[PDB]
Amino acid sequence: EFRPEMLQGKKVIVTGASKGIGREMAYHLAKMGAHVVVTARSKETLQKVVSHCLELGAASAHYIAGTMEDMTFAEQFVAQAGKLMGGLDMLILNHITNTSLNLFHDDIHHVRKSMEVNFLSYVVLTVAALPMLKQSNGSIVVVSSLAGKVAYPMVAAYSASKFALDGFFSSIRKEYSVSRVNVSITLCVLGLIDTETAMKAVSGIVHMQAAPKEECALEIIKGGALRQEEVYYDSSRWTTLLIRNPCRKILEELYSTSYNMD
Amino acid sequence: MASMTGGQQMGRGSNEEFRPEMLQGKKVIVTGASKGIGREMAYHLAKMGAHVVVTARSKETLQKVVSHCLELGAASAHYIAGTMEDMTFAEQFVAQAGKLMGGLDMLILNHITNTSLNLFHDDIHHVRKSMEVNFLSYVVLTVAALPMLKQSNGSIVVVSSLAGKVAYPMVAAYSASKFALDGFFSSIRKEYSVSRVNVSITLCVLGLIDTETAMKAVSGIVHMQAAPKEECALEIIKGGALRQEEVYYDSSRWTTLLIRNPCRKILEELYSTSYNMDRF
Numbered sequence: 023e024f025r026p027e028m029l030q031g032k033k034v035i036v037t038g039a040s041k042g043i044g045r046e047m048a049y050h051l052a053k054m055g056a057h058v059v060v061t062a063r064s065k066e067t068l069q070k071v072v073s074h075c076l077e078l079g080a081a082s083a084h085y086i087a088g089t090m091e092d093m094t095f096a097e098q099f100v101a102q103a104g105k106l107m108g109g110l111d112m113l114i115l116n117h118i119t120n121t122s123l124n125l126f127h128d129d130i131h132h133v134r135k136s137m138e139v140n141f142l143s144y145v146v147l148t149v150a151a152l153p154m155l156k157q158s159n160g161s162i163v164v165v166s167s168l169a170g171k172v173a174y175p176m177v178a179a180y181s182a183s184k185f186a187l188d189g190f191f192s193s194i195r196k197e198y199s200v201s202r203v204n205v206s207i208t209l210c211v212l213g214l215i216d217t218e219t220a221m222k223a224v225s226g227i228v229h230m231q232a233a234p235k236e237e238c239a240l241e242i243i244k245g246g247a248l249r250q251e252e253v254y255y256d257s258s259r260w261t262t263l264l265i266r267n268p269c270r271k272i273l274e275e276l277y278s279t280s281y282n283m284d
Numbered sequence: 285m286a287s288m289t290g291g292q293q294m295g296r297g298s299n300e301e302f303r304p305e306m307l308q309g310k311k312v313i314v315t316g317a318s319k320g321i322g323r324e325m326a327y328h329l330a331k332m333g334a335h336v337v338v339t340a341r342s343k344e345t346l347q348k349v350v351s352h353c354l355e356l357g358a359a360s361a362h363y364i365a366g367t368m369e370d371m372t373f374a375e376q377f378v379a380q381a382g383k384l385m386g387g388l389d390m391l392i393l394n395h396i397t398n399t400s401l402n403l404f405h406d407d408i409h410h411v412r413k414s415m416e417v418n419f420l421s422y423v424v425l426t427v428a429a430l431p432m433l434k435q436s437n438g439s440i441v442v443v444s445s446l447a448g449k450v451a452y453p454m455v456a457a458y459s460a461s462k463f464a465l466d467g468f469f470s471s472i473r474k475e476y477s478v479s480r481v482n483v484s485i486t487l488c489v490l491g492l493i494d495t496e497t498a499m500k501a502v503s504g505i506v507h508m509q510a511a512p513k514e515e516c517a518l519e520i521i522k523g524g525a526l527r528q529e530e531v532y533y534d535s536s537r538w539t540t541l542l543i544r545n546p547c548r549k550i551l552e553e554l555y556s557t558s559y560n561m562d563r564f
């Protein structure tokens with residue numbers, strides 16, 4: 023069971039926290055009395071986020087503006103954010119490259135960029151944060167999607183990147199389990215959220231029910247805090263009922279007895 | 285006699301039962317076909333009387349697979365050596381292979397970058413390279429082959445793994461890229477379905493196979509049973525010919541029984557009714 027005091031005085035990194043779910047997570051963490059370091063490209067909206075964080079009761083609030091396309095920036099940001107907070111307890115990986123609904127034809131640049139920003143940078147950020155998280159027995163939060171579990175048209179590049187996250191992060195969870203690395207991996211499977219970017223990108227196309235960004239932000243924090251393997255958050259109650267793969271958990275349990283690292 | 289001949293090989297029962305004659309005179313591309321499953325697929329296709337174009341880096345090894353193919357009864361056998369790290373090569377290979385066969389009926393995407401069992405630490409170059417060769421090059425190959433496959437109402441075969449459906453330790457980068465294939469290719473299948481593009485997408489979920497590379501990489505680390513490369517190659521070809529969405533091939537009968545996700549098919553069916561696509 024979750025408690026807001028679980029985040030009181032905790033050192034947290036929030037990527038893609040200029041707007042949407044990221045900003046709401048930073049706001050929730052601020053109220054809980056957590057130390058926060060937010061990142062995105064824009065040096066204006068990150069300044070307006072840090073001030074609203076501080077007003078809500080954050081233990082310390084900071085920003086480091088940059089682009090997650092640059093792997094050197096991602097690696098340097100973690101070392102710098104960790105320097106201001108004197109450690110790290112939670113790494114929230116939320117950022118994505120800008121995406122719109124379109125049928126796939128020949129946009130390889132969008133496929134590559136989607137892999138670089140939505141996946142590759144998450145891996146770079148994890149490598150750079152691992153020593154600090156190992157020290158605090160920290161948590162890694164990976165913000166994914168339903169398109170990261172099931173197939174949907176018009177988001178082919180986006181689905182690839184989100185699917186990779188599942189494959190990469192669930193594999194290293196099984197590695198941390200055997201090598202006794204006390205760093206939890208929380209993968210968040212989200213449906214449509216009422217963010218300004220989402221509402222504009224879905225308008226006219228898919229007009230499904232949109233879940234609130236405020237509650238979405240809280241469930242992600244809850245999931246990470248409790249050290250849950252997976253968090254499911256969507257408006258449809260039929261989703262929650264079918265999204266889980268118990269056969270997958272069984273197969274993984276059956277294959278774990280066939281390996282030797284001894 | 286081919287100018288006085290004519291008709292269709294896929295009739296009633298073709299949808300459910302495979303025939304070797306389904307590949308007779310078919311134009312097929314086989315990537316990563318210098319050894320392992322790829323070579324066995326090329327060999328099976330040659331016996332069926334198919335036109336084949338094989339690729340991998342090794343100019344020397346590629347030559348041998350071609351010679352044995354023509355001896356097996358292939359309609360025409362060719363090779364184009366090059367690395368799948370170079371996106372320009374991948375794009376140029378398809379145009380050249382299509383030129384040598386006068387079209388394309390099946391695109392078999394089988395190649396992967398060299399990979400070993402190791403816990404993940406800091407090897408970002410292996411993560412990037414795994415995405416570039418195991419996934420991103422498959423997407424380039426697909427873009428370049430799509431016009432020809434649209435012409436013949438062709439098939440795309442994507443060779444994946446169980447580690448592309450469920451999580452396993454020591455193959456994090458490999459598993460990331462085998463998962464990306466599922467996400468990208470299952471999404472475009474749903475796009476081809478609505479836009480009435482008659483090009484099938486066959487994703488192959490394979491367990492341990494007895495290839496020379498696999499046996500060397502898994503010794504003393506993982507002790508599961510390995511399945512034969514010959515039969516594995518045939519089941520992949522079968523699925524492409526039957527236009528099956530997914531092919532599952534493994535030693536454990538408990539795998540086949542649990543690997544399927546019927547809840548996923550149901551959810552996809554439920555979400556398809558919520559989208560508007562009379563645009564793009």
Ligand SMILES: NC(=O)c1ccc[n+]([C@@H]2O[C@H](COP(=O)([O-])OP(=O)(O)OC[C@H]3O[C@@H](n4cnc5c(N)ncnc54)[C@H](OP(=O)(O)O)[C@@H]3O)[C@@H](O)[C@H]2O)c1
Nearest residue numbers: 038040041042043062063064090116167214215217219220
């Ligand atoms: N919204 C939904 O319905 C929904 C559904 C499923 C999954 N999700 C997942 O939820 C997460 C957040 O989504 P959201 O809708 O809340 O986001 P959002 O409102 O679109 O915000 C995206 C954030 O990422 C930043 N960003 C964009 N390009 C960047 C780049 N190149 N480098 C670094 N940061 C970059 C943006 O700031 P700057 O432009 O200033 O850089 C912004 O802070 C994502 O991982 C998304 O996949 C959301």
Ligand SMILES: NC(=O)c1ccc[n+]([C@@H]2O[C@H](COP(=O)([O-])OP(=O)(O)OC[C@H]3O[C@@H](n4cnc5c(N)ncnc54)[C@H](OP(=O)(O)O)[C@@H]3O)[C@@H](O)[C@H]2O)c1
Nearest residue numbers: 316317318320321340341342368394445492493495497498
């Ligand atoms: N064997 C198994 O247990 C198993 C299990 C599940 C899935 N699979 C999948 O089945 C497929 C075949 O596996 P396999 O074990 O048969 O492989 P294999 O014997 O290692 O053959 C790999 C092939 O890819 C080529 N290749 C490697 N790196 C390349 C590069 N950079 N550019 C272009 N071609 C390259 C190789 O030739 P060159 O080195 O000369 O280029 C060779 O033709 C792969 O997709 C694998 O993931 C296999």
Ligand SMILES: O=C(C[C@]1(Cc2ccccc2)[C@H]2C[C@H]3C[C@@H]1C[C@@H](C2)[C@@H]3O)N1CC(O)C1
Nearest residue numbers: 121167168169174177212213214219220223
């Ligand atoms: O993943 C998202 C929302 C999308 C992509 C999508 C995925 C599937 C269906 C429609 C759109 C992402 C990428 C992009 C478009 C959408 C809204 C934002 C997040 C962004 O603008 N969904 C909605 C599913 O229930 C899980």
Ligand SMILES: O=C(C[C@]1(Cc2ccccc2)[C@H]2C[C@H]3C[C@@H]1C[C@@H](C2)[C@@H]3O)N1CC(O)C1
Nearest residue numbers: 399445446447452455490491492497498501
């Ligand atoms: O996908 C493969 C085989 C592996 C990777 C692996 C995956 C899982 C467990 C052990 C190894 C790939 C990558 C690399 C090592 C293995 C053998 C070759 C293909 C290659 O040399 N499996 C075996 C599972 O049943 C699905």
